[PDB]
Design a protein around this ligand. Structure first.
Ligand SMILES: CNCc1cc([N+](=O)[O-])ccc1Cl
Length: 330
């Protein structure tokens, strides 16, 4: 089997991407944030505290003839940005782009933190990291991809995120028309439950490539590119007037600037992020200070190849017995 679904930016900045997901019978379609940095499929629901729902579409398990309470199971997750959610668990039929999993754990939110409530466009998350990170207790549950894998034509999914435009998540096949050149594959460590890999270096603009190992995670659920402070300082030093602002929480730059590109290495291959992908717009409405799309990972504890980086590539998440990651230009 295969599936193919379009993923759409939630706003004009590509702050996140949403993908429609069918849950239950008859189908209830919710727009979920596909997150290769976590492993829970959770949704706003008829059980979510009413004051914490503000425009989201909710899953109502009592209206699904295939929903069954997973007795005794609960979940609770905290994300790297300080947001959180928790609740109980149903199993139900879940379909993405024509690919159907029966018995998928659907984690129903009883509580969500304020940043989820305030984002009316995101109805939940669909985790695509390794199932060892799934938070369901006392019986840990499998991700949608892990449940689908045995049925897929090939045990892979691909992320093809757009810049200020829709893109595609495919399951079970590699669309050879969706990228240019060849796909370069690189080793993955699953020890932390992430799609963790090692970039071979970077360049700023037209500058020379610096060969240096940069461990980090491929995370579709993170907006920006978080890299070591040395790398980030070298990037922003090429932008007149750019500075790290403690009050804003990262590097800002004059909105009048033209940003240089940023290149990262994948083995001997190179992925070029155009400068415009690094512009996240005014820090507040009407400001001439703009927020940068490359930020320091110092204090996060891990480097994160988020959407800023991934949207410059066609990315293969190869879930074979020994997982690997593939990157191609596009
Ligand atoms: C932006 N804070 C909530 C949030 C977190 C994530 N996350 O992947 O951690 C995704 C979407 C939202 Cl709306």
């Amino acid at each position: 089997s295969t599936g193919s679904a379009t993923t759409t930016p939630i706003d004009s900045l590509d702050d996140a991407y949403i993908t429609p997901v069918q849950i239950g019978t008859p189908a209830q379609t919710l727009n979920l944030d596909f997150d290769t940095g976590s492993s829970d499929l959770w949704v706003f629901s008829s059980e979510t505290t009413a004051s914490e729902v503000d425009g989201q579409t909710i899953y109502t398990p009592s209206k699904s003839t295939t929903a069954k309470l997973l007795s005794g199971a609960t979940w609770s997750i905290s994300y790297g940005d300080g947001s959180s959610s928790s609740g109980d668990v149903y199993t139900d039929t879940v379909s993405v782009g024509g690919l159907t999993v029966t018995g998928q754990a659907v984690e129903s939110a009883k509580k969500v933190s304020s940043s989820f409530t305030e984002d009316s466009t995101i109805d939940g998350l669909l985790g695509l990291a390794f199932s060892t990170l799934n938070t369901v207790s006392p019986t840990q549950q499998k991700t949608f991809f892990d449940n689908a894998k045995a049925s897929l034509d090939s045990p892979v999914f691909t992320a093809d995120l757009g810049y200020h435009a829709p893109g595609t998540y495919n399951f079970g096949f590699i669309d050879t028309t969706a990228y240019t050149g060849s796909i370069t594959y690189t080793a993955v460590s699953t020890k932390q439950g992430f799609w963790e890999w090692t970039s071979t270096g970077y360049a700023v603009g037209s500058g020379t490539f610096k060969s240096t190992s940069i461990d980090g995670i491929a995370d579709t659920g993170t907006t920006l590119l978080y890299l070591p402070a040395t790398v980030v300082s070298a990037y922003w030093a090429q932008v007149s007037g750019a500075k790290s602002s403690s009050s804003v929480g990262g590097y800002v730059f004059p909105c009048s600037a033209t940003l240089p590109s940023f290149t990262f290495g994948v083995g001997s291959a190179r992925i070029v992020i155009p400068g415009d992908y690094i512009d996240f717009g005014p820090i507040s409405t009407g400001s001439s200070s703009c927020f940068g799309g490359i930020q320091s990972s110092a204090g996060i504890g891990i480097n994160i190849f988020g959407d800023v980086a991934l949207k410059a590539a066609f990315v293969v998440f190869n879930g074979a017995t020994t997982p690997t990651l593939g990157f191609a230009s596009k």
